[PDB]
């Protein structure tokens, strides 16, 4: 019995450990979020299937690691769901072929927010899984330890809802002018959703975001967001109604807005936060 990965390493007869670097594509689902499906990443086979049956379990103590180690969730093993981190060993999966076949493990995360996320840097540890292998022939009892790493920079969603993008950059026409902001949100199941903006503002109305450009800044102008013409102040919750599986645009537009005094030539930049809430 031996196992291999989709990203070029393996563990031979007798077990051992390996570092698995996975290109993550997490997704929200109803009541739990997929962090990683390893059934495309880890494959195992039986070396003498005519005369030996191999038994494979997920061993207790399998858990999230690194920046995810505080999170709990569930693990789907061979079609059934168990609490994760694992407090008890799963039932057995039988391997009875020389053909390498999936280790059927998928890790999920219990939602904690509306639409927030954890930003994961490429190369970060996300989980440690213990594959236990026995057979019906001798007393072999081996551990195949899979250390799961993010291969890519990614955001793991922690909410019931997810967004088309986490980091949006738009370019205004030269002053004066406006530009639409592409940003949509959807939820695994229908949710009553709102959002509010965050940032530093220049005006007594708390609605013109300061020009924080670092090189050759203009003076006298900031950035103001509107929704169909209505100004959005900071820390003022806008309702999106009921948001379901179809993506809903926030309908945001960026504008220049004067902050007082002489307007001078130069660059303009504002960084604005968007945060979702359940209503």
């Amino acid at each position: 019995f031996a196992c291999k990965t989709a990203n070029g390493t393996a563990i031979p007869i007798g077990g051992g450990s390996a570092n698995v670097y996975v290109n993550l594509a997490p997704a929200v689902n109803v009541g739990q979020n997929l962090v990683v499906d390893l059934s495309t990443q880890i494959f195992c086979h039986n070396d003498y299937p005519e005369t030996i049956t191999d038994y494979v379990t997920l061993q207790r103590g399998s858990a999230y690691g690194g920046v995810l180690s505080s999170f709990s969730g569930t693990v789907k093993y061979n079609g059934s769901s168990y609490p994760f981190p694992t407090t008890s060993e799963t039932p057995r999966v039988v391997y009875n072929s020389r053909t390498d076949k999936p280790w059927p493990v998928a890790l999920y995360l219990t939602p904690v927010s509306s639409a927030g996320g954890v930003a994961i840097k490429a190369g970060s540890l996300i989980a440690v899984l213990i594959l236990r292998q026995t057979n019906n022939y001798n007393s072999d009892d081996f551990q195949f330890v899979w250390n799961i790493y993010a291969n890519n920079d990614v955001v793991v969603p922690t909410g019931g809802c997810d967004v088309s993008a986490r980091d949006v950059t738009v370019t205004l026409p030269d002053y004066p002018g406006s530009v639409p902001i592409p940003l949509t949100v959807y939820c695994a199941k229908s949710q009553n959703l709102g959002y509010y903006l965050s940032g530093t503002t220049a005006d007594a109305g708390n609605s013109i975001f300061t020009n924080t450009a670092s090189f050759s800044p203009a003076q006298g102008v900031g950035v103001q967001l509107t929704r169909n013409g209505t100004i959005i102040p900071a820390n003022n919750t806008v309702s999106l109604g009921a948001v379901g599986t179809s993506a809903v645009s926030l309908g945001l537009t960026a504008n220049y807005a004067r902050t007082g005094g002489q307007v001078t030539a130069g660059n303009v930049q504002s960084i604005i936060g968007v945060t979702f809430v359940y209503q």
């Binding site: 909410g159 980091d167 902001i181 950035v223 307007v263 030539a265 660059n267 968007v274």
Partner: peptide, 13 residues
Amino acid sequence: ADVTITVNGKVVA
């Protein structure tokens, strides 16, 4: 915050 919007612009004399 959940999402960050970076708005870039320019004032020309």
